[PDB]
Amino acid sequence: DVQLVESGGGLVQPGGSRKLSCSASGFAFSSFGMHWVRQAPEKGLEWVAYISSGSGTIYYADTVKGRFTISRDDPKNTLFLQMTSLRSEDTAMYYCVRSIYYYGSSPFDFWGQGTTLTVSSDIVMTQATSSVPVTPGESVSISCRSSKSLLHSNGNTYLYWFLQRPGQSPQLLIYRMSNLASGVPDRFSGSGSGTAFTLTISRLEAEDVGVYYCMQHLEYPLTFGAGTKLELK
Amino acid sequence: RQEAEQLKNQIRDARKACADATLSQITNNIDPVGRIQMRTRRTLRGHLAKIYAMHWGTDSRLLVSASQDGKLIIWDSYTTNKVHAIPLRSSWVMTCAYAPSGNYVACGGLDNICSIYNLKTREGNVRVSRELAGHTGYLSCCRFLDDNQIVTSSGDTTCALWDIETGQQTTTFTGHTGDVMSLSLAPDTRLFVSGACDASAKLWDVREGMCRQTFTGHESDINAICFFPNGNAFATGSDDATCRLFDLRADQELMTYSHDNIICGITSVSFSKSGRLLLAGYDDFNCNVWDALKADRAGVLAGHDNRVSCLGVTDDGMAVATGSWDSFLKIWN
Amino acid sequence: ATAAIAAAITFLILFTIFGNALVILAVLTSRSLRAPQNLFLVSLAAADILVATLIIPFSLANELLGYWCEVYLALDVLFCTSSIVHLCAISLDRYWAVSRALEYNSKRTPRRIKCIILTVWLIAAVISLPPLICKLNAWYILASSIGSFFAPCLIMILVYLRIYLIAKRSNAQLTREKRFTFVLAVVIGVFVLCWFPFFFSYSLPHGLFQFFFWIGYCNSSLNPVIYTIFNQDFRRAFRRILC
Amino acid sequence: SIAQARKLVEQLKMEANIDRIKVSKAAADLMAYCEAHAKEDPLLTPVPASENPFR
């Protein structure tokens, strides 16, 4: 099926440069918008940049503005990230994410594998607590509180859930707070109203174990929660 | 031939034996609807040639249109955004349908083929799933039953049911003597009625495959047919400037919908959410709203600058879409 | 009296706005008028609306109790010269359409028409700028007179003579020949009758000269009927808009 | 065409042996359906501009 393979992450002295490159195969690369999402080696996903489908709209983060530059070449089916002045706040696993936008679509539905780079108002999303032990067969409610209300006037509440299996990329579970991504069981379900949100698993299997992330897609920049891991008590 | 003429006289005799009073006696006490005042809320402008078909999705927001520039466009009718543009392998397309799941669209025309398009691909594009070739006519109409069965009419005087997974005709519905022009499924999809170029409409059993009833009474080619929301009647537009209401349990023609200032043909017919309105698009560039129970013309839709070729009411009844030969779709409410 | 002249010029401004707005409305909202050559008529109608709604009130104020500028004179020359050279570009498009029939049919692209529109607006701006880089003024009178009237009028006359030759060569029939003779006469004659006395008096008594000055503005109002009323598609669009 | 006309005769014999009901009854059924569903039809009486998704 579809693949995204990142390449170009190695050791760089602080203040230097490196260019990342994600190579796509197996889908229509030109119709998708593309994202970079990094993960620091401690914990946590956060957003870097966005280039649109026809490369006409580009957004960056505040810790990315000026120094990084995203680009794509559609005949080559590749995405680039030219990075300059690499500080110690840039050591991360970097993911290229494909995302499409029309009425009823699934953004953020396939993520690449990653490249470890090493060197040397915004909507705040909160998840408390960060670790809940579950037993294989018992339900669990994973919550996510936001600062600004994600319910838009059109009727869409823009909240996404992601599951990162331990050692893998994170993958889409829920999109726009109540839908269900393709290839996902109906055990998962999404609920909430405006500011408070809940992910509910029913009859939990011990392959749902991992860290759960809530993302806001109401405004740019895109902000993730701190995460909530489940474990194997 | 003598036996067939005796059977025709017997059917006519029983039809008169069940027909003491008509709808103008029963619906005489009922109060009218007045003038219906609709306005163009939207105008969908992306096609560059004549629009021949449209079909609403069952979420009452998305709709396909077909035109002769070789494109199927999926429209978002609330934002006027266009969600897809499907390039067609043959541009001589006369019909299009939306699957009630939302996952597929169909189209066809002078290629004699019903092509089926997957809208939900992992690759993020729309590609041809199947091409259904068994007809020798031209594809007049097609309607999905579900994701695996579609019923098509054609201008080789026949109708057909298809398995989409194998690409093969399951049953074939023969018995018309002219080119079949339209079809309409019953709201439980166990029956459908088709109208042809022999001025007669036929009730067909979907699972068995044989004609139940035949409805003569028009004077020219039947162009449009739509089912009543109860499922026990249907309306029928033709080239003789008349819509007629028929009846399944009475086996009978109930009411004509005509006027002296109307001489053109009727391209498309549709009912509203409850009955009580019959919307019909005509060759004289207009659309006329009828009272279904009292035969009083309740309003007009003076929009398009060429003939209104297709129309459809949403699944919840909130709006009416009409397309025409001047390359525009209009949403009316 | 002067009230009658003021009512005449008010009627002229309103009829200019109505005719040119009707041309713009018919071209932008119709399938049959989506040919890429009617963008010349949209830009000519915009030029005529901008002649009227800006220049003719200031001229009417400077004629009625006449006293008082440089920006106004430059914009007057700009919009009138742009209207004349739009007529010249329409004339050349028609000539190439019937002269090199099938291989210019593949070149009547909307972007080519937009390039010709932008070029004739740049030519009008280059004519208008030297009096800046109320009066009205030799070295500028002569060059502006040539590049404003005498080159586009001579090109329109030569082009329409060759149009006449192609039409008579391609040509029920004896009424068709009187038809295109009358149409080419009206098209080539209202332009000359409106603009030629001003540019003759200008390249060479103050009553006739101001009369010629206003007869120049009259062509800006006579252009929508001349460049639409003989087309059946414009006539059907106009009857469906106003009826 | 003895088999074709025979199939026409068998089709008309399946046509004629069908039980039919009174036309006034079916008129009453259509009018009863259109009365029991009238206030669920927003083309009869248009909704105000807040329950309309097309403004």
Add this chain to the structure above:
Amino acid sequence: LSAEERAALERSKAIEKNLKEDGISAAKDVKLLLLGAGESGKSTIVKQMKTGIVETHFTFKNLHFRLFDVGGQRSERKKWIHCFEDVTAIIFCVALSGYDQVLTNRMHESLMLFDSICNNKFFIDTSIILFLNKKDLFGEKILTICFPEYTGPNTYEDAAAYIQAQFESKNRSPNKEIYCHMTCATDTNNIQVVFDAVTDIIIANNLRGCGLY
């Protein structure tokens, strides 16, 4: 209008870009019908230009022609002939050697079909390229059993001119022409005849678009 609604609107505008570019690319072609009667020379004409509808493309002098053959449609013409209303011209094919062959008569059927498509309300301002085929076969078969009122000479030239005048007598319209030609199924360039006729048609359409024709 939120973040996902700006991107859906950007996608919509990209689709609109591609639609307008496809329309500009499609306006450069010359579309043509082929409407002859049965065994009349339609296959010979499409051979010289090299179940549903058949479309043959050819290029001549940097122009692209699209010829549509609807003979596999054995249905009623009245329900699909409006699909070809904005075609540039019609190519009609007649066998000149079918004056004596019966199916009735073969050439009276051609007169019927030509009158039917010429006096149609969808082809009122659509002109016709009429190919009179089987020129040599008519030259060795050669009239008064098809036209007994003809009462004239029995020579090739005058008989062919009589059939052409009798065939073009059914126009009854000012805004359209019939561009006739005779073909003996081995002529080297009949694409030139179509090119010259289409040039005359486009000149007449452009002059009629100015109030001049």
